[PDB]
Design a binder for this molecule. Structure first.
Ligand SMILES: C=C(C)[C@H]1CN[C@H](C(=O)O)[C@H]1CC(=O)O
Ligand SMILES: C=C(C)[C@H]1CN[C@H](C(=O)O)[C@H]1CC(=O)O
Ligand SMILES: [Cl-]
Ligand code: NA
Ligand code: NA
Lengths: 248, 248
């Protein structure tokens, strides 16, 4: 059986609800869990789902350059696959492999309806309305590395207020939008999940960038090409879209 | 020096307009030529552009399984890279490698404005308005392989009318839309190019599927992972977006 690392994140992975105790893979459900099952159906492997111990996706430390999260598990061969809303990025692609994307997306803004704010530029040029991102994720890294004036300005604002405006999870960011005057820079797929359930919330502007989620494997893994082919098959037979419709 | 296979397709690749006759790489421009130049700078290779002799992208003969087009050139090692609007598909991925996508898109419908036609199902349930696609391309292959009722029905229609509703190029399909009662099934990125320039035309419905275009390499090519990393770099620094804006 392959060891599959993943992390709790609605509606990709959550704990299945039951009146009775649940065990093993049966404990989990969500889009990535359905995806994993479908990949299993196509490729013929068995697997054990394990939540990443440190609760992180995968970033490199500023000082020592140590990797953490699901990415680190793959690097050290403590897992065979990572199946999660894990963004395919330049810095990650240099240390692990990714399948072709099972979802395509971009950074955008979660905020409230009915305001004058219509774009990232509107946020960048003011300070009354606070804004931020999940600390150390692909979204924050985008802003940290941008040489675009607007996003450059936004990173200056965020980094000078790290403790106060950067959050530890999508959920935290979402709650802050719901309970303070705050705009949350977050991935469009997850924004769409939220706005479908909170009628007062909306995406502001369009996508700021473009990226995919891919299944991660340790570099040199034989499963990378197999998983890519299975994802393409699922895409083409319309299964990925059915799964999205199911969970969103 | 790398041999790069490509094909004329506006605005991805076109003959540069000039009084003086141009030679070698100077003949060509377009989104894909910009992409090639950007890749060349990051990875440090020189190259010769060659238009694929048979003028095809790459399909399998369904009697004998032989491949054609740019896919065949890569398989036979007659080219090092294919840089074109070449869709990443299940059947092609089994025989060549693709970089991560530099553009994401989907099949949709090009038609005239002001009709009640709102979806593929609206077309499928009638026969007065003809419809078709480029013969043997990724769009056609999608319909040919689909088990979805609406799409299977559309495939029955198109395949039985093979001689009259399937075309040899996007250009031919577009002229069909302009000059008769016909809806063209084609890739959304190309539709966007067309609708921006013909105000009487529009996209009907949304995307029917999802796919990317990627750089092709012969299977096992070392350039695959380097090209993927270069694409991610171009995407993250906003260049791919500027390239699309330039050419669309
Ligand atoms: C759930 C979060 C922490 C993850 C999910 N995808 C991004 C990633 O792969 O880093 C992170 C979100 C973000 O940065 O907006
Ligand atoms: C220009 C055409 C012939 C190509 C472009 N991409 C698709 C491909 O890679 O097959 C084809 C279009 C299509 O099938 O609608
Ligand atoms: Cl890949
Ligand atoms: Na890699
Ligand atoms: Na391949």
């Amino acid at each position: 059986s392959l060891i599959v690392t993943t992390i709790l994140e609605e509606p990709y992975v959550l704990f299945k609800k039951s009146d009775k105790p649940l065990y093993g893979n049966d404990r989990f459900e969500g889009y990535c869990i359905d995806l994993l099952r479908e990949l299993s159906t196509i490729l013929g492997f068995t697997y054990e789902i394990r939540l990443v111990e440190d609760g992180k996706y995968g970033a490199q430390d500023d000082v020592n350059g140590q990797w953490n999260g699901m990415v680190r598990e793959l690097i050290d061969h403590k897992a065979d696959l990572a199946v999660a809303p894990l963004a395919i990025t330049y810095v990650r692609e240099k240390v692990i492999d990714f399948s072709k994307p099972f979802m395509t997306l971009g950074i955008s803004i979660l905020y409230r309806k009915g305001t004058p704010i219509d774009s990232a530029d509107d946020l960048a040029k003011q300070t009354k309305i606070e804004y931020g991102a999940v600390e150390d994720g692909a979204t924050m890294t985008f802003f940290k590395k941008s040489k675009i004036s607007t996003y450059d300005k936004m990173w200056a604002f965020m980094s000078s207020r790290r403790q106060s405006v950067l959050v530890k999870s999508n959920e935290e960011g979402i709650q802050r939008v719901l309970t303070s005057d705050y705009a949350f820079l977050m991935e469009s797929t997850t924004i769409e999940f939220v706005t479908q359930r909170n009628c007062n919330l909306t995406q502001i502007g369009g996508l700021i960038d473009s990226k995919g989620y891919g299944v991660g494997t340790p570099m040199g893994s034989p499963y990378r090409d197999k998983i890519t082919i299975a994802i393409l098959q699922l895409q083409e037979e319309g299964k990925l879209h059915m799964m999205k419709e199911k969970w969103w």
